[PDB]
């Protein structure tokens, strides 16, 4: 609610990170194209054109905010349909896995 | 020839409905069309046909001999073939599969003797 420098910076950082510049709504200098099939209702004047991309992936609805989990939450695994091939589903892991991972033992 | 309410027995069901539905029009309409009973009645109708094609010529055969059916059936079966996809074999491709493993297990048994007798 009250953006703090630490936070603003964590957003301006996320913005800089290499990614794909959204392409559904092309940019104009005097008009903001707004999805017709979207909650936003244009003001009045000549600044909002009701442009409709060929295939916008977003649907509407909101999200009720949930407080920060006090501890790592376990996640039961429920499967999908497509399956990756052992070869590809391996390096995929080995490209982002924490290999020499330091770990505590605790008491057995 | 399975409980899969196929395109054939389906073309007929739509006729029985449209038929039994207007015969209910005018008068108390005390009987809302069935459907679970219609699907099953048309299933044996399409089935009785595949069975003994001839019957559809004899006066007194349930469903099959009303003018709609057949003219109906065929034109269904028609478009039905022109869309089968390729994997139509998915039907009972479970027991069919389990039967193939059954054979390879017995054939593996053969190779096992070829493997011993002639060492």
């Amino acid at each position: 609610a009250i953006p703090t420098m630490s936070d603003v910076r964590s957003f301006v950082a996320r913005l800089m990170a290499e990614g794909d510049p959204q392409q559904w709504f092309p940019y104009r200098v005097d008009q903001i194209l707004y999805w017709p099939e979207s909650p936003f209702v244009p003001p009045i004047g000549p600044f909002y054109a009701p442009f409709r991309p060929v295939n916008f992936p977003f649907t509407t609805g909101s999200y009720t905010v949930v407080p920060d989990a006090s501890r790592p939450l376990r996640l039961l695994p429920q499967y999908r349909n497509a399956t990756i091939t052992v070869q590809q589903a391996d390096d995929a892991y080995e490209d982002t896995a924490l290999s020499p991972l330091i770990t505590t033992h605790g008491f057995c | 020839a399975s409980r899969t309410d196929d395109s054939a027995t389906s073309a007929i069901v739509s006729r029985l409905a449209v038929q039994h539905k207007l015969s209910q029009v005018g008068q108390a309409s005390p009987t809302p069309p069935d459907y679970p009973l219609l699907w099953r009645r048309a299933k044996r109708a399409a089935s009785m046909f595949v069975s003994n094609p001839s019957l559809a010529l004899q006066v007194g055969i349930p469903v099959l001999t009303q003018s709609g059916m057949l003219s109906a059936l065929t034109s269904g079966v028609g478009t039905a073939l022109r869309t089968g996809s390729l994997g139509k074999g998915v039907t009972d491709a479970s027991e069919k599969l389990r039967a193939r493993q059954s054979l390879t297990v017995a054939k593996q048994a053969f190779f096992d003797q070829i493997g011993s007798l002639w060492p």
Binding site: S10, R14, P72, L98, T103, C108 | T104
Partner: protein
């Protein structure tokens, strides 16, 4: 409680700090005592034996005539057991080994009865059994601990119990797309299925990292191996989160000791594991596996098994090779289900009890219809986690209540109620079903050799509960049938302790070795001529 308050206590040892410092190896300059509790350590084996034989010699010296010396041997070797029963073959009247297993060590305690000069402490078969049980467990406890990494060593892929994670940065878990972030999620969960899989999201002032660790054990390596492909996970639940949790931990073990019930369950996952490991077993089915086949981890990645359950299977059955793994829905309690399902061996562990309760039927009457179906299903072997009080009709206060008005149990008094049978009635009912088949009751053996399933998956426990579970395992044995061999013949039937009984194994070849073992320790072994028996 039970022990009276001693007049005075005189301390000794190497760092007493309140009494003189003595060295029990040599002679002592002090007077006698009723109780001379000795607890000194012996520690490189022969002189170590001398050390012990000597220490006990002076400790069994400091005791008042008619006292109680309590030495503690570190390595009760059959090298010291000759010297002890020779030198002090007289010194005391009674003698008991009191091995208190706190950790894995072979140091046992010996107490001497009446410190009277003319005693006769002869080495008995008890000792052979006691001593033998001890070791039988260190192989079990050691083999078990092998699955654990050495402290302070960076986690590699080598360690069996190693915790492997996958940290992604602002991962875009997308459904229907094999994008890396969602692709890594696959492997990870595949590499640690029966485990935990904990996902976290810590917000750095930069991006938002999201590690997703899990305790990769050997129970996953067995499962993952059977996998032909790595299925995807419905990333919706993950995509929903959008809240920061605490940072990951990466700890081989959880913090609390598993429920007495798990000590027992992980006592069969080791048993079914060892049974299914048998080659000739071939095709096996599981009547009522979990909603998600939990048996796939306890089977050699080559055996062809077919788990079944009323509920739908949790794992995408497609990822497993159809030939090797099959899945049938619907219950086995219903006659229909048994059409076209032939397996040479069935296993009804964890279900058989719930079916009798679900089908609201009598336990004996239930298996009365199941066993014959397995025979028809074409089954040579059978394993059913039946719940009958074969050891005693005595129950556990909090774990299982045995309502006697109606043959039934109450696991956690209420949480679930399942009917039971009796050792004898159910025994003869099954023997009447399969007359030629040989029956046998396998139960969680005190050797705790099953351990590489509790300490192996990374779960704490109470060395005191092993007792509870070896008593909870006795309330629900695993009746192992085997139509492939002739059954035994016990002349007393409800065989009473201390009575000579006639047992007859019908084997065509006289050139065989009889070796009856009870508790995971052999007790009677030897061809007809010579038979070493520690059971009597």
């Amino acid at each position: 409680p039970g022990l009276p308050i001693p007049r005075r206590i005189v301390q000794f040892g190497y760092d007493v700090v309140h009494g003189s410092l003595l060295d029990l190896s040599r002679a002592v300059p002090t007077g006698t005592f009723g109780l001379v509790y000795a607890d000194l350590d012996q520690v490189d084996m022969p002189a170590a034996n001398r050390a012990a034989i000597a220490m006990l010699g002076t400790a069994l010296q400091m005791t008042t005539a008619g006292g109680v010396s309590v030495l503690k041997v570190n390595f009760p070797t059959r090298a010291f057991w000759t010297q002890v029963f020779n030198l002090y073959a007289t010194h005391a009247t009674t003698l008991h080994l009191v091995k208190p297993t706190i950790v894995n060590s072979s140091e046992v305690f010996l107490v001497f009865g009446g410190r009277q000069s003319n005693g006769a402490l002869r080495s008995t078969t008890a000792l052979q059994r006691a001593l033998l049980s001890l070791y039988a467990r260190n192989a079990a406890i050691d083999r078990a601990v092998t699955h654990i990494p050495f402290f302070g060593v960076p986690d590699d892929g080598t360690s069996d119990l190693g915790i492997d994670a996958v940290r992604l940065f602002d991962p875009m878990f997308s459904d229907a797309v094999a994008n890396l972030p969602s692709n890594a999620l696959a492997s990870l969960v595949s590499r640690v299925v029966p485990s935990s899989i904990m996902f976290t999201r810590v917000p750095s002032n930069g991006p938002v990292s999201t590690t997703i660790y899990g305790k990769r054990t050997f129970l996953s390596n067995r499962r993952r191996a059977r996998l032909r492909d790595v299925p995807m996970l419905i990333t919706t639940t993950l995509v929903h989160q959008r809240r920061f949790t605490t940072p990951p931990t990466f700890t081989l073990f959880s913090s609390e000791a598993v429920p007495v019930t798990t000590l027992v369950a992980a006592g069969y996952n080791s048993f079914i594991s060892e049974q299914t490991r048998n080659p000739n077993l071939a095709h096996l089915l599981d009547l009522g596996t979990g909603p998600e086949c939990r048996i796939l981890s306890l089977i050699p990645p080559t055996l062809q098994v077919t788990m079944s359950d009323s509920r739908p299977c949790a794992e995408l059955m497609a990822s497993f090779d159809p030939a090797l793994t099959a899945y049938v829905q619907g219950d086995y309690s219903t006659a229909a289900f048994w059409n076209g399902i032939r397996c040479d061996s069935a296993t009804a562990i964890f279900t058989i009890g719930a079916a009798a309760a679900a089908a609201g039927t009598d336990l004996i009457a239930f298996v009365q219809q199941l066993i014959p179906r397995i025979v028809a299903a074409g089954g040579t072997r059978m394993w059913l986690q039946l719940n009958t009080p074969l050891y005693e009709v005595s129950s556990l206060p909090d774990l299982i209540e045995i309502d006697l008005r109606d043959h039934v149990y109450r696991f956690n008094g209420g949480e679930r109620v399942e009917p039971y049978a009796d050792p004898v009635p159910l025994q003869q009912a099954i023997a009447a079903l399969l007359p030629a088949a040989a029956l046998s009751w396998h139960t969680l053996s005190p050797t705790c050799d099953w351990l590489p399933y509790i300490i192996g998956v990374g779960s704490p426990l109470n060395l005191s509960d092993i007792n509870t579970a070896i008593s909870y395992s006795r309330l629900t044995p695993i009746l192992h049938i085997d139509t492939t061999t002739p059954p035994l013949r016990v002349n007393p039937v409800p065989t009473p302790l201390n009575q000579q009984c006639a047992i007859r194994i019908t084997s065509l070849d006289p050139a065989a070795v009889l070796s009856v073992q009870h508790n995971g320790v052999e007790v009677i072994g030897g061809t007809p001529g010579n038979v070493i028996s520690v059971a009597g």
